[PDB]
Amino acid sequence: MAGRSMQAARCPTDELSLSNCAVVSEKDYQSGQHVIVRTSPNHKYIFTLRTHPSVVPGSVAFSLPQRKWAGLSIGQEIEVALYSFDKAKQCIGTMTIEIDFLQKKNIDSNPYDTDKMAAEFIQQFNNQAFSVGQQLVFSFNDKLFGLLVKDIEAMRQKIEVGLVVGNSQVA
């Protein structure tokens, strides 16, 4: 709660890097808790934790997409503090997302049903933090894509950062 010191690391496997979650150790936090990264006296971001037996105590692993977003480097010192959302006014009911093909070298003309996408989206990104302008990756049918939150609405006000729940619609 007082915010401790940590060290930026690299994402363990290629599965947690597709969940847009800050992989940490079990000796530090627990899967399900939210935190707020603190790099500079003016830079504040919000991520979702997900423990893994591959993480080293005293460090948080981030994926490339998260690095290019939060401007984090591999080996820098940062402060992590627990953060509890206000499900009474921050829940995401409708969040528009700019989707494209992640691995450029993997783009086709085949049509993708959105309904099936928004279904596998919440079934994997449920109870997580998403900010406006955040960059991550989506895996639909073993296919990597590049998402980009543009707008988020409450469940209709407009919020900067929200929490995706079960009954969260995605466009």
Place this chain on the structure above:
Amino acid sequence: AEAMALLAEAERKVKNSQSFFSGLFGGSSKIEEACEIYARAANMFKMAKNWSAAGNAFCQAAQLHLQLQSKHDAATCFVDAGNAFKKADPQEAINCLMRAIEIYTDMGRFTIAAKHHISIAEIYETELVDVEKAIAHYEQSADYYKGEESNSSANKCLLKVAGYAAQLEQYQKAIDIYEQVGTSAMDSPLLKYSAKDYFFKAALCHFCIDMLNAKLAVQKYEELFPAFSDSRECKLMKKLLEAHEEQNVDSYTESVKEYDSISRLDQWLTTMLLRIKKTIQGDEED
């Protein structure tokens, strides 16, 4: 005509005489006859296609020849032994060859020492697959050639050195070799023509290059648009340098596809091109 028998007689005569055998004089006169024996033996061993046997036989004849004081025709025997083991089932070859050079080198016969030296590393690369020991030889050998005024051969060797040095990751240590073999190739208007590939390689090799080391090797280059030969060197290079400096693993990978049209990419090129192909991707993804 019995190899086994010859191998026996040779023994019974290869021993410093003394007493009633020595008489008044002797020594080298006997050991030489013995060498001729083992040689005849290895000869029929190779006749029966026992090679391995022929090789070890030559090893005996050679070793004996040293015990006589005749390093020359001895080392030549070591060579024969190497040709035998090489076209045989054992691996020995390498050994014999080394034992050959030590002679040609100590004797001063560097010309032939290098003549074989190149074959040495050529085997330590096509057989033992030990490039780390192959390059050392291609190099030490090129030094001898370059010393025997023989520039052409020295360059053949250097080409081997640099060529395999880039495969091992030694990129900078390769470009240096290409630069040198490039400035020492223009003194012969009978080589200018090929001097291209040199610049192409030296500019392709990148020791994690970040700036214009290659842009500089391509600018030093004197291309003559009306000298169409150059179309297989710089023209492409410039387009690749741009596709690199602009983190575009498409313009580069497209240029490799196009150039691969006007000019077939060989093994080497392919391998390195792919290495540079990934230096861009990782940079697009940082």
